[PDB]
Amino acid sequence: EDNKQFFGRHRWVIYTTEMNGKNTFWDVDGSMVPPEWHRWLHCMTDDP
Amino acid sequence: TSVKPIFSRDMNEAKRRVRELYRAWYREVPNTVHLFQLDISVKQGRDKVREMFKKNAHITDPRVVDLLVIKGKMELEETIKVWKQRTHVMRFFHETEAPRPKDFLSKFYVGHDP
Amino acid sequence: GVRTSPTGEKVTHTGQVYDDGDYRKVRFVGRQKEVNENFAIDLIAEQPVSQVGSRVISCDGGGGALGHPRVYINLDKETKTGTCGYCGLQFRQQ
Amino acid sequence: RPTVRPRNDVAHKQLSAFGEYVAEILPKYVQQVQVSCFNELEICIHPDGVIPVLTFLRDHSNAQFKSLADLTAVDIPTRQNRFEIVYNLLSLRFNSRIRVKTYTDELTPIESSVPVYKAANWYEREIWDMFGVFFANHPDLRRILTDYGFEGHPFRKDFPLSGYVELRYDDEVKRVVAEPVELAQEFRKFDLNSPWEAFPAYRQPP
Amino acid sequence: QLITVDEKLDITTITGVPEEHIKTRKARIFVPARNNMQ
Amino acid sequence: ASATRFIQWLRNWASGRDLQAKLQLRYQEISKRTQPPPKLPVGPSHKLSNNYYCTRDGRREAMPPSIVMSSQKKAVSPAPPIKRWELSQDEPYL
Amino acid sequence: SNLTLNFGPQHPAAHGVLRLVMELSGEMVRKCDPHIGLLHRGTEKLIEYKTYLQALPYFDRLDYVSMMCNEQAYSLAVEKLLNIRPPPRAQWIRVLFGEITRLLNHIMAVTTHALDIGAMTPFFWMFEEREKMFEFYERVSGARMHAAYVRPGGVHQDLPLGLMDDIYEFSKNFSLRIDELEEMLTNNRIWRNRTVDIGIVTAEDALNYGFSGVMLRGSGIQWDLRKTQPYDVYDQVEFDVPIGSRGDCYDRYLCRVEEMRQSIRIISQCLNKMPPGEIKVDDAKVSPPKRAEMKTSMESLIHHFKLYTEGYQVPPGATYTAIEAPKGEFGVYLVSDGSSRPYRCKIKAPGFAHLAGLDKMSKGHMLADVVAIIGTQDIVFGEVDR
Amino acid sequence: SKVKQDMPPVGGYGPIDYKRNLPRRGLSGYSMFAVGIGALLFGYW
Amino acid sequence: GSDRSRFLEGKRAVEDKNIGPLVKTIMTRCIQCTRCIRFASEIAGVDDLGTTGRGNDMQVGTYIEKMFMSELSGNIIDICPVGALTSKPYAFTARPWETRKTESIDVMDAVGSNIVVSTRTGEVMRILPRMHEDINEEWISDKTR
Amino acid sequence: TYKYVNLREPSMDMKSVTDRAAQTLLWTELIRGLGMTLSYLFREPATINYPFEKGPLSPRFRGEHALRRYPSGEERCIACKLCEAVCPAQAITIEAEPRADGSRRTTRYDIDMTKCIYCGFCQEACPVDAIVEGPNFEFSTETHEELLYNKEKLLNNGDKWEAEIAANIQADYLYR
Amino acid sequence: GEYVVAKLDDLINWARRSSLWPMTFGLACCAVEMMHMAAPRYDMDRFGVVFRASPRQSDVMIVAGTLTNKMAPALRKVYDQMPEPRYVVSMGSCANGGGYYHYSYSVVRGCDRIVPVDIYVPGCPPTAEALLYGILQLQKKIKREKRLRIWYRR
Amino acid sequence: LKKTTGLVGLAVCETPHERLKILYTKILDVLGHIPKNAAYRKYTEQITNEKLSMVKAEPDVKKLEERLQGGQIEEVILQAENELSLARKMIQWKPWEPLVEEPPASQWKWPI
C-alpha cells in the first residue's frame, strides 16, 4: 500500500511465482487473489 | 357486410393487381439471380414464384387479396433495392431442412406429431 | 459422504451418477465431474441436540436478521427431537 | 396522506370541460370522452375522424396540440376490432396533453396522419410492421423494425413470444439460414393471477 | 365508399403462421376450472 | 500531487488554470471504505395504533375513468395558457 | 448515386449500428434512408410476460447511457397507475441521480460527437469522469450501469454512509473539466466549421416532426418538461434552461454543455437539501418490507412472498407518462388490465422521432455533415429499436 | 439508538462552481501584429 | 388484511399428528376453521377428527394415535385453507405458479371424475379435482388423487 | 427560467475587428487548444496497473453467484423457488424433494449465466440469504457450456468465496 | 528441429498476443463498458490493444451486445472478411447466449451460432475490468498455441 | 421593432396590428359559411372576436402581447393563419353533423 498515491493505485499485489503447482512467474491473473485479500485489494474494506 | 375497401372494390379489380405483381416478379427473377449471384436457375426461381402465388388461389375476399398484393410488392421492393442480402432471398428454398415425412407411417415412426 | 459407483464416477449429494451404459459420461473424459464434497445431510447430523427447559423454543438460525425467519418449535413429544424446518438444528426438552 | 398520490381537482375539471368542448365541436366522429382519476383526457373517435379530429386539435386556437408525442396500437383479440390506435398529443401553448383513440381490424385501412404530423411517418410504419395495420396514403409504408422477409406481426397477442423461425450459420451452404424454432429450454409459463379480486371499484357486472 | 363482401372472414393467408400450425392444431375454448386448493 | 514545482507551473501556464486546486485524481479527500453501521429510520406507517390500512390504501382509491360524454357557453382551452418564461438573472447570456 | 454509411466507426463506439442508405449528387446528400431494426429485440412484447418489477430492468437497457432516467420514467408511470406516492427522500435521490445520469449522457453525447468528427482527445479526458460516476452507480446499486435502483415506490436501497461527501468531491471539480472541454471545441474554428449552420431545423418543423429536448431548444423553443410539467422534486430546485438561437448543430452543442453546468448546479442543491426518512413507500403491498421485518413478522413475510412471486396488482387503466430524459422526452404508454403483469407497454424513445428527421435535416449538406447531424441528435439505437 | 443516515453536514456543503470560466489571455490584435511585423523587420535587416 | 404486524409476543406451537401416509400434518399452521372435521363427519362419514382442549390451546386431531384412512381422505388437503394438511407424496416438489394445468378425466373407476393434471416441464406433478356438479362435485377418491 | 447560449453581437469597432483579424491570421485560438493538450502531457495519468491493481468496488457489487450455508454446514436454501419466480431472465431452474432426513432441499439448482442479467433480484427475494451474487467478476471461460452452472458449481462457489461473501453481507445487511 | 520449432512458436505467439488489434461491434450496452476499457483508467492500448483498427486489419472481433436476426448476416460477413489468425470474444449475456432477450423472436440465442467464439465474458454488462480479464485470458490462450510443433510432426 | 422572434424560421413582422386585423376578419368571413348552430362557428367566432377587440384597443405591440397570452406577436399571427386554414377544412368535413356510426357494443370497454 501507498496512501500517497491516488485512489486506485494506492494498493497493489505482487503475485507469487508459483501457485497450486503452476508456474506463474510470467503467467499471473486476477483470479489468483484469495477471497480474504480480494476484499481488501478491491477497496471493499479498509482493513486487510 | 358493407366494409371499407383497401384498393380493389371487387375480385375482378383485385385479380388485375395480382397479375401485375406476377409480371413484376416474373421479370425480376433473372436480375435477382444475377445480382445476388444465386446458384439456382432462373427456371427454379420462377417456379418458386408460381408456387407462392398458387397457394393463395382459393382466396375470394378482395380485401385479403389486396393485403396479399401489398405484402408481395413490399417483398419485391426489398429484393429490387437490394435491401435483402443473399441469405434473405434463399430462405424461400429451405435448402438445409430435411424433407418432412408426409404419410401416416412415416410420421408414426418419427414421433407423436400428426 | 461422497462415494464412487462401480464405474468410478463420484455420486453427488443428490444421488446423481451416470449408469454404466450412459453415453453422457463422455463429457467428463479428459476433464472432471464437478462434485461438492461437504454434504449438508452429514454436516447437520453432526450438530449436538440442544437441551432447553420449555415446551416451546424459537429458532432464527443464528445471526438475528442474518439467519432465517423466526419459527417456534413444540417439544411436547419425548420420543423425538424438535427440528427446525429452516436450518435443521434439533432441540429437546430437558 | 404520505403514501397516497394526491388528487388534482382543478385539472380534472379543466380537462372535463375541454372534453365536452371537443365533443360538441366534432360530434360527427367523437364516440366517447373520459378523464382518468390521474387526469388524462381521452377522446374515443370513429376511425373516419382521424384526420379531421387531429387537424382540429393541432390547428384550433384553443387546442394547439402541435406535437405528436406518440402513436401506437394495442391488440385486444376479444374485440371485433382488435386493434386500438392511440394518438398521444402535446400542446405547448396550454401545457397540456390529450389522447385520441380509434380502432380497426385486420382488413380495414386507417388514414395516414402524416399530413397532420410528419412525426407519424415512422410510427405508422412501426404499427404496420408490428401489428399489421395498413395505413392508407402513406408515402413509404414498409417494415421498419423486423428482419427483411419476416412473416407475421410480432406484437399481436397470438404471435408466439419466440416466433416461428430462428437463425444460425450453416457451413454447407456458407450463409445464415432460417429454420423452425427449437428451444433447449422452453419458456416456463407462470400462472400468477390470484383467485381473489383486488379492486372492487372496477368490478364488472355478473 | 363501402363495398360488400359476402364471404367468410378468413386471414389464414396473411398472418404468417406456418401451415402445419394452422391445420394440425386443436384449440380448446373453455372457462378455466377453479383451482380447488383455494 | 507528486509533480515537481516547476512542472506544476508549466502545466498551469499551458492550461491557463490553477489545476492543482482541482485535481482530477483522488487522494485522501474520499470517504473511508469502511464506515460505521447505519441506523435507518422507518416510514410513517410504523405505528402501533391508529394505523388501519384502509385509511392509507392508495390502490383502493383509484377509480375507473369519468365518462364525460358517451354515444351509447364560453370557449375553453385544455388549461390556462402557459406563462412566459423569465430570462435568467444568474447569467442571461452565455 | 447511392451509398451506405458503415455500421459504426473504426474506433470503439457505443450507440448501436445503423444502415444508412444515401442518395448523393456530387458531394451533396439528396436523400437519407435510415434502415433501423438492427437492435430491435422485442422488448415491448417481452414486458408482457413479466411482472411490473420484472420489467423494470428492461428500461436500463433502452437508452443504455441514461439508465436511471429510464427507470424513473417507468417508475413514475407505475406509481401513477398505483395511485401511490414515493417518499420525499426517494424523490430527492431520484432527482440527484437523474442529474448525475444527465452528466453521464451528455459526456457521452458531446465527446463521442467530437470523437466521430475526429477530435478524439476530449473523449479520454471526460470518460475518466464517467468512470467516477459509474462508481456512484455501483455504490448505491452494486452495478456500474444497469442499476435497477429506481423502482415504483421509491429506490431499492438507501445511500451508503459517505456517498454524499464523495459526490460533493466529484461535483467540486467538474466545472473545470467542462471548461477544458470547451477550450478544445467552443471557439475552435475547425469545430465551428464542422457544426455551425449544419442541420438547421426551424421551430415549427421541429414541433411537427415530433422532436423534443435539445432538438426543440436549439431552435429557440422554450420547453423543458422539468419546468413545465415537473415530476418528483424538480419544482424545488433552481436551474436555467439553455436556449439556442440558430437551430444548428453548434447551438445544440452549446445547449448540451450548458445543460451539464446546470446539472452540476442542481446536484449542488440536492446534496444540500437531502431530507431524512425512508426510501420506499411505506406500503408493504407495493414495496417489499425490510429484511428484518420479513424474518420476524407474519404479515411482512407474506407480503415479501407475494411481491416476489405474483407481484403487486395495478388497477386497470392506461397512462402516458413522460420525463425530460437527457435525450429528450422519454415516455411510456403503460396499459394495465388489473393483474400483476402489464397488458401493453409502448416506449416513446426521443431518438425515434429524431432519426426520422435525419432525411429532412441533411438536405443540401455534404456526406460528412451527416456524421455531425446524427451526432447532434445523440442517437442510441437501444431506445430507437426497443 | 439515534437514526444514522447519509446526510449533508451541518450548515451544508461548501460552494460548487458551475459557470463557464474561460480566462482572457493574450495581447490585443494591435500588439500581436506589431510583434509579428517587428520580427519580420528584424529578420529582413 | 393490513400490510404489517403489531404482535410483539411469542407464538403458539403445537405438536404434529400422524394420520397416515397420505396426509402430512403441520398443525402449527392450523387456523381452527374445522373444515376437515366437518368434511370428515358429513362427507366421508368418519367421526375421527375433532377438537381437543380449549381456548388458544384448542387442537384439531384425533386425540389418540389414529390414521384417517378413507377412500375420500385426500380431499381434506384441498379444503384445508392453509398448509396444515398437505399431500405427503407431493411434498416439496413444485410451486403452484409454475405448474401447467390440464383438465382431464379419471380412469381409476367408472365414475369419470373430472380432474386437473398438474404438470411441470414435461412431468406429472399431482392430480386435483375439477368441479362437476353432476359427477364428482369437487371431490376425488384417494386412488384418483 | 432560461438563458441564451449563443446570442452575442460582435463589436464592430476597429480594435475589436483587428482582434478578430489577428485570431484568423495568427491562429491564436488554435494555439490555445495546443496549450490544453500540452498541460495534460505533464499531468499524471489515471491508468491503474491491472491485474496488479484493481478498480475500487463496494460491498453491494453484484458479481458471480454462490449458494450459501449456515455455520453448521447445512445449506441455507430450502427450495422455496422465490428466486426462480422473480428472475427477470428465467435463468434459474429448481427441482426439490424431501431429503433422506425429511428436510426440504433442492435436487436441481441451475443458473444459466448466459441468460442472467446480474440484477440481484434473486438475492433480494431469497428469505434465508441462500443465493447471493458474490464479489468475483473474473470468471470468463473458453466455452459456452462452462457458464451453465448446476448446484455443485454454485455450492463450490459458496464454499470458495464464503469468507468474503459473509464480510460483504455483514457490511451491507443494515441497508437491506 | 524440435528445439527451433518450440522457440519459433514462442516468438510468433509472443508477437500475436502482444499486438492484438480489435474490431468491436458496438451493438448495444456492452459497448459502453468496452469504451471504458479504452478510457484512461484501464487503457487497453497500453497492452498493445490499439484503439481503432478496421475490419481488414483486426485480429480479434469483440461482439459487444445483442445480436439480432437482422444483424446476424452482417456480423458473419465481417468475420468472413477478417484475415487470419482471427479470434472472437463474446462479451456479455446477450452475445453469450441471448441473455435477457433469449426468448425473443428476433434475437440470436448466442453469437456462437453464427461464429466460433474463443472467450466468453459473463456479465450484463461485464465490468470494464471483467472484459480486460477476458482479453488477457485470450492472450494466455494464444500463448498456449503450438502451430509449428503440430506442423513439424505432420 | 424587434431584431428576432427568437424562433428559428419565424421572421419578425413590421406591421403586426394590421396583419392581425386582416387575419381575424378573414376568419370571421369564412366562419359565415358554417351553419349557425355548429359549435365550431359559435366558439371560433367568440374567441376570434375577443382577440380582434384586443388588437383594436391596444396599439403597443409589447402591451398587446400580455393581453393575448399567445407568445410573440408573430406566434399569434401564425396561429391565426392556422385557424383560418382549419376553418376552411371544416367546411368540407362538416363535423357538426350527427355521429357517423356507433362503435360495436364493447369497443371501448376496459378491462375486457
Ligand code: SF4
Ligand atoms: S381444515 Fe386445516 S385449518 Fe381448518 S381445522 Fe382442519 S387442519 Fe385446521
Ligand code: SF4
Ligand atoms: S403459505 Fe399460507 S399456510 Fe403456509 S405458512 Fe404461509 S400463510 Fe401459512
Ligand code: SF4
Ligand atoms: S441476478 Fe437477476 S437475472 Fe441473474 S439469476 Fe438472479 S434474478 Fe435471475
Ligand code: SF4
Ligand atoms: S435460493 Fe433462496 S429463494 Fe431460491 S429456492 Fe433457495 S431458499 Fe428459495
Ligand code: SF4
Ligand atoms: S449483455 Fe446486458 S449490458 Fe450487454 S447488451 Fe445485453 S442487456 Fe445490454
Ligand SMILES: [K+]
Ligand atoms: K391445504
Ligand SMILES: [Zn+2]
Ligand atoms: Zn433454524
